[PDB]
Amino acid sequence: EHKHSDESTSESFESIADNNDDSYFQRKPKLTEAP
């Protein structure tokens, strides 16, 4: 639950900028729709 016990040192999110976070942590948070 708590304490990541050290691993990625960022869990699964850690906005660093507006060009990086939108590629390493984001990685398309949505699914494939294609209407």
CA 7, chain centre distance (Å):
14
- Contacts with 31 (C-beta within 8 Å, 6 or more apart), sequence order: none
Angstrom distance (rounded) from CA 19 to CA 22 = 5
Burial group, residue 18, by CB count within 10 angstroms (0-12, 13-18, 19+): exposed
CA 34, chain centre distance (Å):
22
Q: Solved by what technique?
A: NMR
> What value does the CA radius of gyration of the chain take, rounded to a whole number of Å?
13
